[PDB]
Design an enzyme around this catalytic site. Structure first.
Site, PDB file in Angstrom:
ATOM      1  N   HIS A  78       0.824  -1.206   0.000  1.00 29.75           N
ATOM      2  CA  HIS A  78       0.000   0.000   0.000  1.00 29.75           C
ATOM      3  C   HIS A  78       0.862   1.262   0.000  1.00 29.75           C
ATOM      4  O   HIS A  78       0.565   2.228  -0.702  1.00 29.75           O
ATOM      5  CB  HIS A  78      -0.985  -0.012   1.172  1.00 29.75           C
ATOM      6  CG  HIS A  78      -1.888  -1.210   1.181  1.00 29.75           C
ATOM      7  ND1 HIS A  78      -2.592  -1.607   2.295  1.00 29.75           N
ATOM      8  CD2 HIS A  78      -2.199  -2.100   0.207  1.00 29.75           C
ATOM      9  CE1 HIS A  78      -3.294  -2.692   2.012  1.00 29.75           C
ATOM     10  NE2 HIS A  78      -3.074  -3.012   0.749  1.00 29.75           N
ATOM     11  N   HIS A 237      -9.291  -1.549  -4.923  1.00 25.59           N
ATOM     12  CA  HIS A 237      -8.203  -1.940  -4.041  1.00 25.59           C
ATOM     13  C   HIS A 237      -7.267  -2.939  -4.716  1.00 25.59           C
ATOM     14  O   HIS A 237      -6.056  -2.900  -4.501  1.00 25.59           O
ATOM     15  CB  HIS A 237      -8.654  -2.514  -2.701  1.00 25.59           C
ATOM     16  CG  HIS A 237      -7.497  -2.741  -1.783  1.00 25.59           C
ATOM     17  ND1 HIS A 237      -6.941  -1.727  -1.035  1.00 25.59           N
ATOM     18  CD2 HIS A 237      -6.723  -3.832  -1.571  1.00 25.59           C
ATOM     19  CE1 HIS A 237      -5.901  -2.194  -0.366  1.00 25.59           C
ATOM     20  NE2 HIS A 237      -5.739  -3.467  -0.682  1.00 25.59           N
ATOM     21  N   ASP A 241      -3.319  -2.492  -5.109  1.00 21.23           N
ATOM     22  CA  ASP A 241      -2.361  -3.540  -4.777  1.00 21.23           C
ATOM     23  C   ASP A 241      -1.422  -3.812  -5.956  1.00 21.23           C
ATOM     24  O   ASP A 241      -0.208  -3.950  -5.777  1.00 21.23           O
ATOM     25  CB  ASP A 241      -3.086  -4.831  -4.356  1.00 21.23           C
ATOM     26  CG  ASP A 241      -3.495  -4.833  -2.867  1.00 21.23           C
ATOM     27  OD1 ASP A 241      -2.961  -4.039  -2.085  1.00 21.23           O
ATOM     28  OD2 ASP A 241      -4.349  -5.628  -2.431  1.00 21.23           O
ATOM     29  N   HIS A 264      -0.877 -11.003  -4.933  1.00 25.27           N
ATOM     30  CA  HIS A 264       0.517 -10.599  -4.824  1.00 25.27           C
ATOM     31  C   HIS A 264       1.505 -11.647  -5.332  1.00 25.27           C
ATOM     32  O   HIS A 264       2.532 -11.297  -5.906  1.00 25.27           O
ATOM     33  CB  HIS A 264       0.825 -10.191  -3.384  1.00 25.27           C
ATOM     34  CG  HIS A 264       0.082  -8.967  -2.954  1.00 25.27           C
ATOM     35  ND1 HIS A 264       0.272  -7.745  -3.556  1.00 25.27           N
ATOM     36  CD2 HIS A 264      -0.870  -8.775  -2.014  1.00 25.27           C
ATOM     37  CE1 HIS A 264      -0.515  -6.846  -3.000  1.00 25.27           C
ATOM     38  NE2 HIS A 264      -1.220  -7.447  -2.061  1.00 25.27           N
TER      39      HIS A 264
HETATM   40  C1  LIG Z   1      -7.420  -7.899  -0.155  1.00 28.23           C
HETATM   41  C2  LIG Z   1      -6.247  -8.867   0.091  1.00 28.23           C
HETATM   42  O1  LIG Z   1      -5.529  -9.086  -1.124  1.00 28.23           O
HETATM   43  C3  LIG Z   1      -5.291  -8.272   1.132  1.00 28.23           C
HETATM   44  N1  LIG Z   1      -5.874  -8.049   2.437  1.00 28.23           N
HETATM   45  C4  LIG Z   1      -5.795  -9.073   3.458  1.00 28.23           C
HETATM   46  O2  LIG Z   1      -5.313 -10.169   3.209  1.00 28.23           O
HETATM   47  C5  LIG Z   1      -6.509  -8.799   4.755  1.00 28.23           C
HETATM   48  C6  LIG Z   1      -6.226  -9.587   5.923  1.00 28.23           C
HETATM   49  C7  LIG Z   1      -6.962  -9.314   7.149  1.00 28.23           C
HETATM   50  C8  LIG Z   1      -7.949  -8.264   7.174  1.00 28.23           C
HETATM   51  C9  LIG Z   1      -8.666  -8.026   8.376  1.00 28.23           C
HETATM   52  C10 LIG Z   1      -9.282  -7.833   9.383  1.00 28.23           C
HETATM   53  C11 LIG Z   1     -10.009  -7.621  10.525  1.00 28.23           C
HETATM   54  C12 LIG Z   1     -10.653  -7.439  11.518  1.00 28.23           C
HETATM   55  C13 LIG Z   1     -11.433  -7.232  12.689  1.00 28.23           C
HETATM   56  C14 LIG Z   1     -12.679  -6.606  12.655  1.00 28.23           C
HETATM   57  C15 LIG Z   1     -13.411  -6.426  13.832  1.00 28.23           C
HETATM   58  C16 LIG Z   1     -12.906  -6.873  15.050  1.00 28.23           C
HETATM   59  C17 LIG Z   1     -11.668  -7.500  15.086  1.00 28.23           C
HETATM   60  C18 LIG Z   1     -10.941  -7.678  13.912  1.00 28.23           C
HETATM   61  C19 LIG Z   1      -8.234  -7.495   6.015  1.00 28.23           C
HETATM   62  C20 LIG Z   1      -7.493  -7.768   4.779  1.00 28.23           C
HETATM   63  C21 LIG Z   1      -4.518  -7.064   0.709  1.00 28.23           C
HETATM   64  O3  LIG Z   1      -5.120  -6.014   0.535  1.00 28.23           O
HETATM   65  N2  LIG Z   1      -3.141  -7.121   0.380  1.00 28.23           N
HETATM   66  O4  LIG Z   1      -2.610  -6.012  -0.058  1.00 28.23           O
HETATM   67 ZN   LIG Z   2      -3.975  -4.509  -0.373  1.00 23.71          ZN
END
Ligand SMILES: C[C@@H](O)[C@H](NC(=O)c1ccc(C#CC#Cc2ccccc2)cc1)C(=O)NO
Ligand SMILES: [Zn+2]
Ligand SMILES: [Zn+2]
EC number: 3.5.1.108
Length: 297
Positions: A78, A237, A241, A264
């Site tokens: 990011h 998003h 990425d 990724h």
């Molecule tokens: C998009 C993908 O590629 C990726 N994102 C993730 O893998 C990812 C992992 C975990 C979370 C989370 C969370 C949470 C929470 C929470 C909510 C309420 C209470 C407690 C915890 C969000 C995205 C990403 O964007 N990579 O760049």
């Molecule tokens: Zn991301």
């Protein structure tokens, strides 16, 4: 000529790592011509530096991790997306821990930091990598592609069948001739499915995640109270990425990236596959900015 760019001043922020939940101090600093972006783990003794280049990527588990031996810098995508979008060629990034802070889940906070620091033009030509031949990689039904294009364009399609995604666009093709990275891409938040997040948390992972820094969806609904920032925030998003990973090439791109359910790991395979074949790309500069198919002004 189109000149290389760095930061005008040092600037700082704090946050927590998404994976680790660890509080981390972040510093962005100016750097000389031809430095690229170099991450430094300033908490270590000795301090360890890792250039942000494709060849230094280790793990790609839902994120992009730079590695040097046993030392890692996690979740660089990011921040690197913001660097790419604002045309920052050279910068040092200092971290007090092994993960870039997640901030609000988007690239927006990093855009704010960069714009606040200011942009400094440097006395050296900015180099671009121009795609000459289409290159692709696949894993199962996932696909990532570089296509020749007279400009810079990023296209992406996701293909979720879950009810929450039904009717959603799930596709975007962004030509940066007429689209603002800052206004239309940078603030797209990361997202996760409840079942996936639960699995991570059950193992003591994703400890920094909250509804305050991620879009959470179940099979049927977006769980965040105020919904989405962009109508097509999910695919935006994915584009964010991709732009972050693209920057590991070391130079801005003249060409098109096309992703199809890619992530990724595949993005990085694409980079290494492109780099290895010298017939598929070339490095160019523009002594006359008006003849360039892109603009960083
Ligand atoms: C998009 C993908 O590629 C990726 N994102 C993730 O893998 C990812 C992992 C975990 C979370 C989370 C969370 C949470 C929470 C929470 C909510 C309420 C209470 C407690 C915890 C969000 C995205 C990403 O964007 N990579 O760049
Ligand atoms: Zn991301
Ligand atoms: Zn489903």
């Amino acid at each position: 000529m189109i000149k290389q760019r760095t930061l005008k001043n040092i600037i700082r922020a704090t946050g927590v790592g998404l994976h680790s939940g660890e509080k981390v101090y972040l510093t962005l600093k100016p750097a000389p011509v031809d430095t690229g972006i170099v991450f430094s783990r300033t908490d270590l003794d000795p301090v360890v530096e890792i250039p942000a280049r494709a060849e230094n990527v280790g793990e790609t588990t839902m994120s992009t991790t730079l590695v040097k031996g046993d030392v890692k810098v996690d979740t660089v995508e990011h921040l690197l997306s913001a660097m790419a979008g604002l045309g920052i060629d050279n910068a040092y990034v200092e971290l007090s821990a092994s993960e870039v802070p997640i901030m609000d889940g988007s690239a927006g906070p990093f855009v704010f930091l960069i714009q606040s620091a200011g942009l400094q033009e440097q006395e050296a030509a900015k180099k671009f990598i121009r795609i000459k031949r289409e290159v692709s990689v696949e894993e199962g039904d996932k696909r990532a592609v570089f296509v020749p294009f007279d400009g810079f364009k990023v296209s992406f399609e996701i293909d979720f069948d879950h009810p929450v995604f039904r009717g959603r666009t799930q596709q975007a093709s962004v030509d940066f001739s007429s689209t603002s990275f800052v206004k239309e891409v940078s603030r797209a938040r990361t997202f996760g499915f409840m079942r996936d997040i639960e699995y991570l948390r059950s193992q003591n992972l994703a400890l920094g995640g909250s509804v305050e820094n991620a879009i959470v969806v179940d099979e049927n609904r977006v769980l965040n109270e105020d919904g989405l920032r962009y109508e097509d925030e999910f695919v935006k998003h994915k584009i964010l990425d991709a732009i972050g990973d693209l920057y590991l090439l070391g130079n801005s791109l003249i060409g098109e990236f096309r992703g199809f359910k890619s992530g990724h790991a595949l993005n990085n395979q694409l980079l290494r596959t492109l780099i290895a074949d010298k017939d598929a790309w070339e490095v160019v500069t523009f002594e006359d900015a008006r003849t360039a198919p892109i603009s960083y002004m």
